[PDB]
Amino acid sequence: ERGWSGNSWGGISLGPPDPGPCGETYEDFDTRILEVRNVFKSIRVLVAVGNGKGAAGFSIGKATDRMDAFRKAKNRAVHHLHYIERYEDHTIFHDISLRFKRTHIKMKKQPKGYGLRCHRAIITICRLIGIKDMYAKVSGSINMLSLTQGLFRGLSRQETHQQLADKKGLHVVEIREECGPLPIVVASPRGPLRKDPEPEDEVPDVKLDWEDVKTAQGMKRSVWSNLKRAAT
Template sequence: MSRWRVSWTGYFEQLFKADPPARTLDILGSTVLEADPSFSCEPPSLTEMAQVVNQLMGDKTAGICVYHDVTSTFKKTTIRMKKQNPGYGLHCHRAIITMCKLIGVQDMYAKVSGSTNLLNITRALFQGLGKQETHQQLADRKELHVVEFQDAYGSLPIVVASPKGGARSDPEPEDEIPHTKLDWNEVKASQGMTRSAWANLKRTIW
């Protein structure tokens, strides 16, 4: 067990076991508990907590762990996460930014739709990250090489995973009509339908 995990565990053990001091009000004579009891150790930093999370999850969250675009819904909260190239940063809700820093996600775009309840956002985020498929798992399931394209290399495909049993000879079948899930808000934005129909109306001033 690492020293960061020991520090983290000891801090929260004191947090749950400590009895906060009490004081008596002069007017009402009632007892009010103070919210901040004193502790003998400092809380762990974000770096230490991230290292503990990586150890608990077997280093699966180290570095960039968003393998593909994923949509996750919990109750009335929907999060659409998109993988981005290195250096893009975190462009998402402030709660998602904090959690991504803890688990090691460095580049991601995420849009929250519906309720912005923090508990719902947390559950939806971890459900989405947990149900995604790694490049190696996708290659083994499809029995094909998995490639990705980056702006720095232009149209040159980069092989990121290969099937363990070798790639099959027949290509992946394609439907005549691709089954692509579209977001209606993005469709309206691309068609210029987000603006009001009355935006360009000329009004006569008397």
């Protein structure tokens, strides 16, 4: 099977990580190549690993031979694993806007069946993590290492519903249009519950993105948005 292109290393699987000197096996982990570069000769490889159940990581490996670089990167990646929280084990808990160096990433939580409409590297990393429904937009410099670092950083700093309930001492109630006006309580505080309601902010002072508002108002006209694509 080919990667992102016929002649591209990116997206290619390297197989499970080798059994570690600690004695752990990683047969449930898959490895993917994100970047291969000639260092002036040696090779620097950026790879990502993940078990598809929230545990995922990435690493750089430098070696004169490509296979040695792959092995080094994979083995070092398995020992630097992030755990990524997933809402209902298919998507993220909330929208995440981040900037790592000069790379900006906007991530949007999506319902089931939406799929991965993301940068191809983000699609690979999401498949490794176990995220199945998400939207992502990458802006600024498209630098692969910065993209990976920013993605992992933002995904590792997402607040779960239980965390929000404990912080605010209130019920987190979900409203679904497909479920009508039925209130679904997704999280309740473990401790006592505050009896005073949250201030009913008549107009919140949030920082909006012109991109989202322009799309919502129908003034987006891009011929490249919402194109039909293969299942991801």
